[PDB]
Amino acid sequence: GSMEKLAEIMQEIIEAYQEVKDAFFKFIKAVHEGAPEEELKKYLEKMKEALEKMKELLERLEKEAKKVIEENKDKKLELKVLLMLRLAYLLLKVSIELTKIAAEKLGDKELVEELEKESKEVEKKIKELEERIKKLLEEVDDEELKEAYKEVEEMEKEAEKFLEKMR
């Protein structure tokens, strides 16, 4: 069913995130050696193709999350599903910002422009989700979910600290 489907999409999002990371760290290693630009551009292309994949999977996650919510109209399930979406968009945000860092080093100005748009859009979606999630925290009485919210919060803080160290 759709709860399995949500988890399955999440696995595909995490896998595409991993491809972005793998390409980014190989890109950074290659750029510090002075690798030829065709290899650098390969890794940037790999990040872009995986980002495209993640963007589409997030649209599937989102359209599937919405059906599960509203069909269930359950607070705990909605909170669970928004926290999954909250995690997926964090992974997308990291993936965008890593590709942006690579695009900037390679001087790919049009990709950097497009990634600027994607990162503001994901920031906006993250802030919308934070607003809904904070509302449900009052409404649910499962401290496991409250710990899960605290965890993704600490994930984003560490991810931002990591992103600043890269650029």
């Binding site: 709860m3 949500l6 988890a7 999440m10 696995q11 995490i14 896998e15 995130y17 991993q18 990371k21 669970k80 926290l83 999954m84 995690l87 992974l91 990291v94 499962d142 496991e144 979910l145 899960a148 965890e151 993704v152 600490e154 994930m155 560490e158 991810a159 600290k161 990591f162 160290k165 890269m166």
Partner: peptide, 22 residues
């Protein structure tokens, strides 16, 4: 020095698996 356990994709998988099984 740069590695963050929080960026780990296995951690994200385990976090989903935890969150999903709550």
């Amino acid at each position: 020095s740069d590695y963050s356990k929080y960026l780990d994709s296995r951690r994200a998988q385990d976090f989903v698996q935890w969150l999903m099984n709550t």
